[PDB]
Amino acid sequence: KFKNSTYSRSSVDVLYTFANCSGLDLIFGLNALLRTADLQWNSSNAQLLLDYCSSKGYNISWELGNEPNSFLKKADIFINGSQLGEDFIQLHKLLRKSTFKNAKLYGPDVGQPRRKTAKMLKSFLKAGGEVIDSVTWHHYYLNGRTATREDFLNPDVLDIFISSVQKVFQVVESTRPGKKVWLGETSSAYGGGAPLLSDTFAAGFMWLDKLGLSARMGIEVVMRQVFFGAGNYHLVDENFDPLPDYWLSLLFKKLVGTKVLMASVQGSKRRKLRVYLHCTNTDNPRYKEGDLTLYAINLHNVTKYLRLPYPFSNKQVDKYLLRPLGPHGLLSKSVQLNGLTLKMVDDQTLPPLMEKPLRPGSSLGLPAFSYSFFVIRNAKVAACI
Amino acid sequence: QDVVDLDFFTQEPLHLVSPSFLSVTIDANLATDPRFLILLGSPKLRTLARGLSPAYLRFGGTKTDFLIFDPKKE
Ligand SMILES: *[C@@H]1O[C@H](CO[C@@H]2O[C@@H](C)[C@@H](O)[C@@H](O)[C@@H]2O)[C@@H](O)[C@H](O)[C@H]1NC(C)=O
Ligand SMILES: *[C@@H]1O[C@H](CO)[C@@H](O)[C@H](O)[C@H]1NC(C)=O
Ligand SMILES: *[C@@H]1O[C@H](CO)[C@@H](O)[C@H](O)[C@H]1NC(C)=O
Ligand SMILES: *[C@@H]1O[C@H](CO)[C@@H](O)[C@H](O)[C@H]1NC(C)=O
Ligand SMILES: *[C@@H]1O[C@H](CO)[C@@H](O)[C@H](O)[C@H]1NC(C)=O
Ligand SMILES: O=C(O)[C@H]1CNCC(O)(O)[C@H]1O
Ligand SMILES: [Cl-]
Ligand SMILES: [Cl-]
Ligand SMILES: [Cl-]
């Protein structure tokens, strides 16, 4: 199905300019399917690109291959994990001889850990683990072709992610203990997303739960498929309009800090009410060192009222509740924050993200099929200072 | 009854995520779009991308392994 294409210096400059102008750090995936007679990686094309990027002073991070578990199906070429590790060693030597000698290298961008993908990841980390800065793997919950609305709302579907994460760490801890683990490419549903689902408010349950579980379980970076593009799972549509998952991602960015804590619900069922707890993002100008950010998903069909434990039970709390703009409910492409539709001010201006101050000591209201952030002001948590 | 008590563990950080914890991709297949320069040059799109800084932007996808650098091409 997939044919070779070429790309130009112009295309590399379009990509870098976009990243540089947007304050993003570019990671560029190199072609792993360029192979010598005896099925070693042929590095000559990568050398041409490395030399061009060095010549323009482009600070770029590297990957080599995408889903190498799939090469036999996609390209009728099998590369084992041992060989792929050797290929990474050869790329690492090229980076060390380039103008950016400390450039980062990530891999191997394997699919989620089935028997044969786990085997490839294990043989890859044995062989090439020393030269990668982080281990990358990919995750999707469902086939976008067959995914249902019910699937997007089902805690039994959300929970499958936990076993994938546990299996990747089991491989990494048996081969390269302590190596950082990244989700290199992830979203709701593969094959470009679930039509009329992956681009809606309903998509946000999987996205926010995945962020929560990833942070809680030790994943250091989660890369969302895709910021912009042909797939339904895009954060920004073809008209450059932000979808609900964009707004959810912007709020997460503004409110949720680097230090991960834990929240849990005291009842025996820990299924439809999902709660996560970090220190507040120190860069949010509204908040101060020691503040907490709670985020919660309610997959019940009724409102739940959350009570904060001592010593947080009487603190001022800032609510950031997301609900769809009607009439399409969870299948809406528009979202409201505390009842205000989120929309660009103009092409250059994001809107302000207006909190709703709750009366101190009130229970936190979480409507049916909704998600919210709650900042606990003056929490004075020592772990967060 | 629809009231739920939360329990919080706050003693110490259980993990530290990157400041770029929430990162994004661009599919390598987008570079095969004739309008690639228009799309990524969009001032509207760059404003939206700046809102998620700091973050990684990973350029990759199935097409990663079907793309060849041609330094002659225009
Ligand atoms: C709502 O979901 C019900 C099962 O969930 C439980 O009952 C409801 C009323 C909530 O209190 C929730 O917290 C419980 O977990 C279903 O049996 C019922 O079919 C659904 N009701 C409606 C209106 O769709
Ligand atoms: C792409 O080119 C590589 C070598 O440069 C080759 O191995 C592969 O068969 C080509 N793929 C297709 C489907 O043309
Ligand atoms: C690698 O590919 C380049 C360009 O296609 C070719 O000139 C070179 O001979 C190849 N190297 C090996 C070892 O096959
Ligand atoms: C490249 O950028 C990283 C931040 O992503 C920076 O820490 C590193 O030192 C940079 N390398 C150079 C030489 O600019
Ligand atoms: C992995 O593939 C390489 C390259 O073809 C081969 O030389 C090696 O024997 C293979 N290892 C295993 C265990 O299959
Ligand atoms: O939507 C999908 O199925 C993705 C799977 N991984 C590679 C890719 O990002 O290019 C997509 O094809
Ligand atoms: Cl996968
Ligand atoms: Cl293998
Ligand atoms: Cl795309």
Author numbering:
A (entry chain AAA): 159 to 543
B (entry chain BBB): 1 to 74
Question: What sentences appear in the manuscript?
Answer:
Surprisingly, siastatin B also inhibits both β-glucuronidases and human heparanase, which cleave β-glucuronic acid residues but not sialic acid or N-acetylated sugars. Herein, we show through crystallographic analysis of protein-inhibitor complexes that siastatin B generates both a hemiaminal and a 3-geminal diol iminosugar (3-GDI) that are, rather than the parent compound, directly responsible for enzyme inhibition.
Unlike the three other co-complex structures, the structure of HPSE crystals soaked with siastatin B contained a 3-geminial diol iminosugar. Compound 8 is a further breakdown product of 4, formed by the elimination of the 2-hydroxyl to form imine 5 which rearranges to enamine 6, and the enol can then tautomerize to give ketoamine 7. Despite the additional hydroxyl present at the 3-position of 8, when compared to glucuronic acid, this compound appears to be well accommodated in the active site of HPSE. Indeed, both hydroxyls present at the 3-position form hydrogen bond interactions with the active site. The hydroxyl at the 4-position of inhibitor 3 lacks the hydrogen bond with Trp391 which is seen for gluco-configured inhibitors. However, as in the costructure of 4 and BpHEP, the axial 4-hydroxyl forms a hydrogen bond with water present in the crystal structure. The presence of two additional hydrogen bonds with the active site of HPSE may be able to compensate more fully for the desolvation of an additional hydroxyl in the geminal-diol containing inhibitors. This in turn may be the reason why geminal diol inhibitor 8 is observed in HPSE, when soaked with siastatin B, instead of noeuromycin derivative 4 that is observed in the other β-glucuronidases.
